[PDB]
Design an enzyme around this catalytic site. Structure first.
Site, PDB file in Angstrom:
ATOM      1  CG  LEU A 143      43.009  61.021  42.454  1.00 38.73           C
ATOM      2  CD1 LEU A 143      42.654  61.451  41.048  1.00 38.73           C
ATOM      3  CD2 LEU A 143      44.035  59.909  42.397  1.00 38.73           C
ATOM      4  CG  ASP A 144      48.726  64.425  47.642  1.00 37.84           C
ATOM      5  OD1 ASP A 144      48.050  64.846  48.607  1.00 37.84           O
ATOM      6  OD2 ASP A 144      49.969  64.434  47.621  1.00 37.84           O
TER       7      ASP A 144
END
Ligand SMILES: CCCCCCCCCCCCCCCCCC(=O)OC[C@H](COP(=O)([O-])OCC(O)COP(=O)([O-])OC[C@@H](COC(=O)CCCCCCCCCCCCCCCCC)OC(=O)CCCCCCCCCCCCCCCCC)OC(=O)CCCCCCCCCCCCCCCCC
Ligand SMILES: CCCCCCCCCCCCCCCCCC(=O)OC[C@H](COP(=O)(O)OCCN)OC(=O)CCCCCCCCCCCCCCCCC
Lengths: 59, 85, 53, 144, 84, 108, 241, 134, 48, 446, 48, 48, 112, 151, 97
Positions: free
Chosen positions: B39-40
């Site tokens: 997850l960025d």
């Protein structure tokens, strides 16, 4: 808060008696509305006709 | 009604299984956001934002940064709602 | 207390009462009824028009 | 101690007094900023707060006394009231400026008012006759 | 136990009621929608039916009883002796 | 970020958080039950400044103009208006222009 | 209030009282009576300070419906407060509203009105500040000050109403319409009615009627401060027209 | 327990900006079908300029912030059961010592509670002695 | 579609904020009297 | 009235006899009950003992004095807890009581002034012997010297009146009228300080703040009223000179009223709020009084009486907080609705009476005073509206912030409400509701 | 303001009645939701 | 003009909170059985 | 048949609530007079408010009898209402006809 | 008894009047002693005009007479007000029927009451009132009707 | 039933306060109620009437109600008493001055 709290679902299907309560509540409204409607539908119309100024001949 | 710790767990699990951009199989419950979920920078708060809407409260802005795992989310929800017991 | 101890012309500072007259109806006893408050003494009687002296 | 024991000192006039006063109020050397002490000043009392509002302060921060969003030893602003959430204060910058709020209200009010009075001069009606009254000496004529 | 939760296998973004259509009208932009699976249980058949059907259910809840009881009352005022 | 201004405040200012907890949770002075509150410098500072700032008051142009327009001009103008209107009204009254019919407040 | 729900206690007497009022209203209508019972307190300089209750079909009917709705409101509260502390506190306040409303409606004298008027405000603050959230602080405190502006106008209005020898308005309006004093006496009455009736520019507190429990919101909007505000005006027709 | 520092990184000044934006979509668009469209349309607007120089990031905040402030719903979707809610913080409860001052007959309704209350109290004293060794 | 609210943001904001009366009756009048009082005590009640 | 006087003298010994705090208290209430029974007066002087009379104006003032003087002992019991010379306290109170009776019944102006200024001492004992703040010293300096610095100078006016008149019974002055333009200021201003006036309010907040519950109750409950009672008796012959120079006094009172109300909003101390509030109300009383119209004067008498009662009760409230949470501040005191909800009822009621909510003898006042002022000058209305508006405004704030917000974190366990304080609050308020039934005795004195 | 009292009182009580009922309806809904008061939050309640 | 508005915002509310989509959370907090909250409403409902 | 034309010709349009001004012209309508039925003495006792104490009061007191007779169910008292409003309606016809009559009598002399 | 509920309201009127009037005749008449209470008649007094420059007792006597007379005339205004009050309540149409014929008595009463007592304020005794009349008589004789300015 | 306690301050003192108030007030009221019921019903109101020309009422004759009769004659000095009081006292003071 409330004894019925579902999760990601519609209401827990309640009793017919409560269903009967609602339907009658709306039904009573309708019954009286049509009751008045047929008993005095003219009221929504002006109760008296509207005579015309030009149509009144100069005696 | 009260709230059950196991159901809090399954519920965060349900949304996590629901969230597409996460690794679909929902790898180990303790999946760190930047490690295997990947997850960025922005995907992380999308996670928090859904959790908000699901659990009926804002998470504090910095305190999201404390939430670094689905275990944390359960742990944060538990501290809120008296779930330990 | 409103029947026997009203605020009359003797005691004062009690509940003084005052009213208007009923509504006649065609076919009523004394239908075309005349004014009863004949003179200003009638107004504000407070029991003084019925004084003992 | 008592109030006279705690009375604030006069405005600090050299840097050493600034260092001392900032400690007197537990403030950092730059955090401390005494009032202008120009003729209606408290002197060494620090000048804090005075922002848009107290509720603008952190909603979720750990507060010793949440009541006023206040931690322990800390110089209370001289105008704590007049900025408290219970008094003049908000949480977020206003959308517009003062003239906007008053202008948008009152400009509309003046115009609509004046335009009404203009239209009262021309008060419409239903073209019907004057209401007839029986009375001595009145002899309105029947259409007969 | 308060309630129960499904597994989310059932929650298919392929929910028919024009969620695919907005997927298409997105597709012209062609970006994605990762959370859309939430709206499955949301717009689900027999939960709330059609909005027009719901409006039918609401705006007409007892009209049939009203008209029937109305006709009975019409018969009463017709034969009981009220007449016209 | 000033290079640790927030931090530098952080160290000391988080110490007395615990002492507040120690004071609040203090089973002993809470057991004494005599009432009272944990001492708070900001409160004590605030009361003292609130009661005493005259020793700071310098009677300069600022304070004078501030006070002058605060009450003085209000007091003077309002009093002058009151006296002026009353002088006119009473002048009419002692002239006898308005008889015992028109005048108002016959009963105070 | 030790063995039966306070909701039951007030509810039953409320329904009983207002049905009696309703039926008396009919009696007033079929006879067209207007009673003006009066109990004087003091009198100096030829003025008579008097507590007056005027009974007419209008007022009786008005308080009637006000009070069935009072009964049904409290009955609803019997559940909406199911799990609240200070339910009893909440309920006696409701009664004080009802009592203060009775007096305000029936009041045919400006002084009697002033009793009920700020009395409505007096309890209005209480049941708005019922909760302990800062919005309720702000909401009630705004409403109370809005109402106080109204009360002040009535209080000033007392001053000029002294001119006509009393404070029994409904017996002087017609005979002395055009006078400058009665003109402005209506003006102050006009302003006070605006405040309680939340007329613009004073329409800023009825939005702040929303912090109170929705029973209070019901009984603050159904027939309460706002309605009594216009009800003061209906009692004052002449000069307004 | 730990009280966090107030320092903030440009990532956070930009991501919490995305958070507030998502909120501002809600307050201006409600229908979840409409929402997810526009929320993902928003994402593209946060994605087309994903990585830029710091200076451009500062101008990006100079525009981003204004958009929120100038396009903020006059009635934001303030959250129900949280700080600022429409009914949050409805009531408060006082410190337990109020229960300590019940009249002995008042105490005489829940002896089992008060007995356990007495026990826990002494055990708390031991705990507080521990808390910093008194 | 096009949301008319954003079409007429300013007017809608005015229309939606009740003609900005709440700002008038809260922000636009309390600032001065409160300052006025504290101003006054610092000038007369306790100063001059 | 010598009946009362001898009763009080024979009560004096109880101060010496040990453990007579409560026996004294019941006696003071009992004699108040006796003095209640003695009531037949008209406008003329009545009950003319050797030099003591009584009247509408004096009868109610005395009843309040006996009333409040008994309520002291309910208010203050920490003296007994501490054993802080209860004997001197009781002796000080009774001595004060006798002086008040003799002040209000002195049919001579000079006898009146004599007891009036004799009361300077026992009050000063009451603050100083049982004060708390270190300010108690400078406060006593303010109280005594503001008073004596003008209260002494009327001594010349009194003697000048003697020389031109030949006596100092009140009826005798009324027969004459003086217009030398210094007699007026010398008497007027000398009373105005004790009234007090807004420009000489200065001392009064200090005296109340650093004084015990008892002293503050006395200070706001009689001293201010006693100044006014003298005015009512003395302005009979100051009329012409007053008419020429009156706009100044009414102006500063009305102007000061809105100001001091705004001081109340910004103030942050329970006693300071009430102290400033009491100055505000006595501003309006001074206004209606200086109107001299019938409505003004007969209403002034009422508002003095009602204001004294409400101010006392509010001080008992301030004492309650000061005796639980040990700090006068607004900030520390808060949320008490959670700790004494049955008490917050009384907080509301006493607040209600101070904002003129009926049935309230206070309210009955403002109708009278406001009618007088409005008749006197229409210009007043522009400030009368704001004066009452801000009057209620700060009272709202006082009630709410003190009782409403979330509790204070650092607050050490304190006992709960108790019968003494409960009965004390009922006793100050309930008569304030009683009197409206029979205002005619408290409403008509001219 | 025109000067028709009967219609005012007639409509006054009429206004009073059903709006109180509407206030009751809202109160029922609001509790049956999680103490939230936004029309946006609510949706089809007829089925429930 | 206002009369149309009365029907306007009335139906505006009708669609949103009561025939539109259920803009709610996961919990289905809805109940209908409670008689008291109804029976109190019913008498007014009949009279209305 | 509206009111806006007044602002253009504030002369031509007669105005509101306007008394007749050419009734002397008896070559047209209005040759007979009014008629009084309910005597003012009975009307006085009727307590009919002055706003209505006009030529249509005989039926008004008639209705009051109907309503004071069978008050508990006024709905039965229908025809008395029906007639009364009709008698008023005829008066309203006269009100209009008066308006246009004085309009007619105005027009025939306008340009002359 | 044409009307139904009015034919019922009478029934409760019989219910309410019943026990009370029974109580009056039952436990009052057999338990009441007869006693009489009259009404003052204060002798006249030599008013301020009569009394001497310094006759303090006499002046005090005059003022008390003035006060009592004030309290009565103070009142006569009220009674006339109450009297007019009844008339305006008489009948809904009946306002102009007897307002002016009855009110004007009250109007004259007010003006006369003002002239004698009005404009003095509290503390006003017989002396200030009496001399005011003297001043008014002088004004009337010199400058003519009050309400004309001066010449 | 499933009661979950609530932190509530003591109500005892307040409840006792009401009880004492109700107790003592009824205590005082009962003999008062007895006394007022007695006089009014055992004796009741003296009737107004004219003066018998040869008579002279004593000051207690001028109050209608009996409890007033008892109070005025026994407990309150007559107006005529408190009238001559002043006339005496004002006589001396005028002379002295
Ligand atoms: C007088 C008196 O005090 O008698 C006792 C009693 C008041 O105590 P209570 O009724 O037992 O209070 C409820 C519980 O004690 C429980 O009371 P609580 O501890 O929950 O507190 C509730 C309330 C206590 O007061 C009330 O709950 C309302 C009752 C009237 C006070 O006091 C508060 O804490 C709220 C703040 C006060 C707001 C002001 C409300 C009064 C407005 C007056 C308008 C007129 O008064 C009565 O006997 C009858 C009161 C009914 C109203 C008639 C008007 C009097
Ligand atoms: C026009 C009639 C408007 C009636 C309102 C008068 C203004 C005072 C008031 O009470 O309004 C509410 C005001 C603000 O309260 P609010 O904004 O709701 O919450 C606190 C925000 N910091 O409340 C306050 O801030 C209290 C202010 C004290 C009262 C000052 C009133 C000034 C009057 C005009 C100058």
């Amino acid at each position: 808060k409330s004894h019925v709290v579902s999760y990601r679902n519609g209401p827990p299907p309640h009793s017919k008696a409560t269903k009967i309560g609602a339907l009658t509540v709306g039904g009573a409204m309708w019954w009286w509305v049509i009751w008045h409607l047929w008993h005095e539908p003219d009221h929504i119309t002006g109760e008296f006709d509207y005579p015309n100024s030009r149509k009144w001949s100069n005696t | 009604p009260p709230l059950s710790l196991k159901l809090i767990n399954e519920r965060v699990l349900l949304v996590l299984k629901l969230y597409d951009k996460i690794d679909p199989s929902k790898l180990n419950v303790e999946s760190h956001f930047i490690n295997d979920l990947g997850l960025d920078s922005l995907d992380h708060v999308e996670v928090i934002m859904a959790m908000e809407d699901e659990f009926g409260f804002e998470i504090p802005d910095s305190d999201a940064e404390k939430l670094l795992k689905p275990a944390d989310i359960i742990k944060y929800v538990a501290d809120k709602e008296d779930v330990y017991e | 207390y409103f029947k026997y101890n009203q605020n009359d012309w003797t005691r004062k500072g009690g509940w003084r009462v005052i009213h208007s007259r009923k509504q006649c109806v065609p076919g009523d006893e004394g239908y075309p009824k005349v004014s009863d408050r004949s003179a200003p003494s009638d107004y504000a009687a407070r029991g003084f028009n019925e004084s003992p002296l | 101690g008592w109030n006279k024991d705690y009375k604030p000192g006069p405005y600090p006039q050299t840097e050493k007094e600034r260092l001392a006063a900032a400690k007197k109020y537990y403030l950092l050397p730059e955090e401390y900023k005494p009032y202008a002490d120009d003729g209606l000043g408290y002197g060494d009392y620090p000048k804090l707060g005075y922002g848009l509002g107290v509720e603008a302060k952190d909603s979720y921060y750990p507060w010793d006394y949440p009541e006023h969003k206040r931690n322990q030893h800390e110089p209370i602003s001289a105008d704590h009231d007049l900025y408290s959430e219970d008094r003049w204060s908000q949480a977020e910058p206003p959308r517009y400026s003062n003239a906007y709020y008053f202008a948008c209200f009152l400009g509309v009010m003046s115009g609509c008012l004046a335009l009404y009075y203009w239209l009262d001069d021309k008060k419409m009606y239903r073209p019907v006759a004057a209401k007839q009254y029986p009375s001595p000496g009145v002899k309105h004529y029947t259409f007969e | 136990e308060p309630y129960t939760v499904p597994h989310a296998s059932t929650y298919k973004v392929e929910s028919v009621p024009q969620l695919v259509e907005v997927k298409e009208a997105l597709g012209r932009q062609g970006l994605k929608d990762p959370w859309l699976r939430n709206e499955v249980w949301r717009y689900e058949p027999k939960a709330f039916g059609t909005h027009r059907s719901r409006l039918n259910t609401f705006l007409f809840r007892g009209l049939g009883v009203g008209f029937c009881a109305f006709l009975a009352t019409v018969a009463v005022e017709y034969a009981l002796g009220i007449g016209k | 970020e000033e290079q640790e201004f927030i931090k530098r405040k952080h160290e000391a200012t988080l110490k007395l958080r615990q002492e507040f907890l120690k004071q609040s949770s203090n089973p002993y002075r809470h057991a004494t039950g005599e009432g009272g509150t944990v001492f708070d410098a900001g409160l004590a500072r605030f009361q003292a400044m609130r009661v005493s700032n005259y020793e700071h008051f310098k009677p300069t142009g600022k304070s004078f103009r501030t006070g002058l327009f605060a009450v003085v001009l209000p007091i003077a103008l309002y009093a002058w208006a009151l006296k002026a209107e009353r002088d006119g009204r009473e002048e009419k009254y002692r002239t006898g222009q308005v008889a015992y019919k028109d005048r108002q407040f016959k009963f105070i | 209030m030790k063995y039966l729900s306070i909701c039951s206690i007030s509810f039953v007497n409320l329904i009983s009282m207002s049905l009696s009022c309703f039926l008396l209203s009919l009696y007033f209508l079929l006879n067209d009576m207007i009673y003006f019972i009066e109990w004087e307190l003091v009198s100096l300089n030829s003025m008579s300070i008097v507590m007056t209750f005027l009974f007419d079909w209008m007022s009786l009917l008005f308080m009637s419906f006000v009070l069935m709705i009072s009964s049904l409101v409290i009955f609803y509260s019997k559940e909406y407060m199911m799990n609240d502390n200070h339910i009893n506190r909440f309920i006696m306040l409701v009664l004080m509203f009802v009592l203060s409303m009775m007096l305000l409606i029936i009041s045919p004298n400006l002084i009697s009105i002033l009793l009920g008027w700020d009395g409505l405000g007096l309890v209005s603050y209480c049941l708005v500040i019922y909760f302990q959230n800062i919005k309720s602080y702000n909401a009630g405190m705004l409403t109370a000050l809005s109402n106080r502006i109204g009360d002040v106008a009535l209080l000033l209005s007392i001053a000029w109403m002294l001119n006509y020898g009393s404070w029994n308005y409904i017996f002087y309006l017609e005979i002395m319409q055009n006078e400058f004093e009665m003109l402005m006496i209506g003006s102050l009455v006009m302003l006070a009615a605006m405040t309680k009736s939340a007329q613009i520019p004073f329409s800023s507190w009825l939005p702040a009627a929303m912090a109170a429990p929705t029973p209070v919101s019901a009984l603050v909007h159904s027939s309460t401060l706002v309605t009594a505000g216009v009800y003061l005006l209906i009692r004052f027709n002449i000069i307004l027209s | 327990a730990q009280v966090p520092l107030a320092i903030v990184s440009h990532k956070r000044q930009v991501c919490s900006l995305y958070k507030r934006a998502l909120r501002n979509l809600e307050s201006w668009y409600d229908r979840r079908n409409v929402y997810r469209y526009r929320a993902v349309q928003l994402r593209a607007r946060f994605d087309e300029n994903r990585s830029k120089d710091l200076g451009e990031g500062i101008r990006l905040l100079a525009c981003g912030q204004r958009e929120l402030f100038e396009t903020r719903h006059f009635q934001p979707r303030n959250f129900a059961n949280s700080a600022g809610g429409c009914a949050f913080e409805r009531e408060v409860i006082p410190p337990d010592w109020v229960l300590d001052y019940w009249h002995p007959l008042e105490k005489a309704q829940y002896p089992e509670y008060f007995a356990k209350r007495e026990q826990r109290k002494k055990e708390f004293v031991t705990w507080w002695e521990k808390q910093y060794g008194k | 579609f096009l949301n008319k609210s954003l079409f007429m943001y300013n007017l809608s904001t005015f229309l939606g904020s009740m003609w900005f009366m709440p700002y008038i009756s809260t922000y636009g009048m309390i600032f001065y009297p409160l300052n006025y009082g504290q101003l006054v005590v610092k000038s007369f009640d306790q100063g001059w | 009235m010598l009946k009362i006087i001898f009763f009080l003298l024979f009560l004096i010994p109880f101060c010496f006899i040990n453990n007579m705090y409560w026996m004294v208290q019941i006696m003071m209430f009992f004699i108040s009950f006796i003095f209640l029974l003695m009531n037949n007066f008209m406008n003329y002087w009545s009950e003319i003992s050797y030099f003591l009379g009584c009247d509408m104006l004096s009868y109610g003032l005395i009843l309040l004095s006996l009333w409040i003087c008994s309520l002291m002992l309910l208010a203050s019991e920490m003296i007994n807890k501490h054993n802080n010379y209860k004997n001197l306290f009781l002796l000080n109170i009774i001595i004060l009581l006798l002086l008040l009776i003799l002040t209000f019944s002195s049919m001579s102006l000079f006898m009146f002034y004599l007891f009036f200024e004799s009361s300077l001492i026992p009050t000063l004992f009451l603050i100083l012997g049982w004060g708390y703040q270190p300010e108690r010293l400078q406060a006593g300096l303010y109280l005594l010297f503001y008073t004596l610095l003008v209260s002494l100078p009327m001594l010349i006016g009194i003697f000048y009146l003697m020389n031109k008149i030949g006596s100092m019974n009140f009826y005798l002055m009324n027969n004459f009228m003086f217009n030398y333009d210094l007699l007026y200021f010398c008497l007027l201003c000398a009373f105005l300080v004790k009234m007090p006036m807004f420009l000489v309010h200065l001392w009064l907040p200090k005296a109340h703040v650093e004084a015990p519950v008892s002293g503050s109750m006395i200070l706001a409950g009689i001293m201010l009223k006693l100044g006014g009672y003298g005015m009512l008796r003395v302005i009979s012959f100051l009329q012409l000179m007053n008419l020429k120079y009156s706009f100044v006094w009414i102006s500063i009172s009305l102007v000061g009223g809105v100001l001091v109300s705004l001081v109340c909003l910004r103030q942050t101390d329970l006693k300071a709020l009430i102290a400033y509030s009491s100055v505000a109300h006595m501003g309006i009383v001074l206004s209606g009084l200086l109107t001299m119209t019938y409505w003004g004067l007969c209403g002034s008498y009422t508002l003095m009486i009602a204001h004294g009662l409400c101010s006392s009760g509010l001080f008992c409230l301030a004492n309650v907080s000061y005796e639980r949470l040990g700090s006068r501040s607004m900030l520390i005191n808060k949320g008490l609705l959670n700790f004494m909800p049955s008490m917050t009822l009384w907080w509301f009621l006493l607040s209600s009476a101070n904002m003129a909510a009926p049935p309230t003898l206070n309210l009955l006042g403002e109708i009278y005073l406001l009618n007088s002022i409005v008749s006197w000058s229409w210009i007043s209305m522009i400030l009368l509206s704001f004066l009452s508006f801000f009057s209620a405004a700060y009272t709202l704030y006082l009630y709410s912030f003190s009782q409403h917000g979330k509790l204070f974190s650092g607050v050490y366990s304190f006992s709960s409400g108790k019968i003494r304080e409960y009965l004390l609050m009922l006793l100050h308020w309930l008569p304030l509701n009683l009197l409206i039934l029979k205002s005619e005795s408290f409403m008509l004195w001219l | 303001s025109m000067g028709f009292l009967k219609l005012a009182m007639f409509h006054l009580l009429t206004h009073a009645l059903f709006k109180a009922l509407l206030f009751m309806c809202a109160g029922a809904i609001i509790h049956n939701m999680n103490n939230s008061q936004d029309i946006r939050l609510m949706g089809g309640l007829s089925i429930h | 003009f206002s009369t149309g508005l009365t029907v306007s915002y009335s139906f505006r509310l009708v669609y949103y909170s009561m025939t539109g989509d259920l803009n709610c959370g996961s919990l289905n907090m809805l109940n209908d059985e409670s008689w008291i909250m109804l029976r109190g409403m019913m008498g007014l409902l009949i009279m209305s | 048949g509206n009111a806006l034309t007044h602002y253009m010709k504030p002369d031509v349009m007669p105005g509101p609530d306007v008394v007749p001004t050419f009734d002397p012209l008896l070559g047209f309508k209005s040759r007979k007079e009014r008629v009084m039925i309910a005597t003012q003495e009975e009307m006085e006792s009727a307590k009919l408010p002055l706003e209505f104490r006009d030529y249509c009061a005989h039926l008004a007191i008639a209705y009051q009898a109907c309503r004071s007779d069978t008050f508990p169910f006024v709905y039965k008292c229908a025809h008395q209402k029906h007639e009364y409003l009709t008698c008023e309606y005829e008066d309203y016809v006269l009100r209009m006809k008066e308006f246009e009559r004085e309009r007619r009598l105005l027009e025939r002399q306008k340009r002359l | 008894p044409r009307s139904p509920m009015a034919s019922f309201a009478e029934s409760v009127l019989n219910v309410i009047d019943g026990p009370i009037t029974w109580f009056r005749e039952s436990i009052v008449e057999p338990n009441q002693q007869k006693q009489n209470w009259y009404h003052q008649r204060f002798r006249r007094v030599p008013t301020i005009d009569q009394c001497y420059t310094d006759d303090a007792v006499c002046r005090f006597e005059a003022d008390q007479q003035f006060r009592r007379d004030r309290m009565v005339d103070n009142e006569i205004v009220n009674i006339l007000r109450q009297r007019f009050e009844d008339c305006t309540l008489y009948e809904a149409p009946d306002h102009m029927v007897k307002c002016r014929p009855l009110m004007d008595q009250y109007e004259k009463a007010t003006e006369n009451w003002f002239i004698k007592y009005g404009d003095l304020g509290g503390y006003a005794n017989a002396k200030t009132a009496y001399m005011k009349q003297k001043h008014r008589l002088i004004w009337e004789r010199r400058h003519g009707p009050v309400g004309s300015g001066m010449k | 039933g499933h009661h979950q306690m609530i932190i509530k301050p003591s109500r005892f003192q307040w409840d006792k306060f009401k009880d004492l108030l109700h107790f003592y007030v009824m205590l005082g009221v009962i003999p008062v109620t007895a006394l007022v019921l007695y006089a009014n019903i055992f004796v009741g109101p003296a009737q107004l009437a004219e003066i018998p020309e040869g008579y002279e009422p004593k000051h207690w004759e001028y109050e209608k109600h009996p409890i007033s009769r008892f109070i005025s004659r026994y407990i309150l000095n007559s107006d005529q008493q408190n009238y001559e009081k002043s006339l005496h006292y004002l006589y001396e003071e005028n002379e002295k001055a």
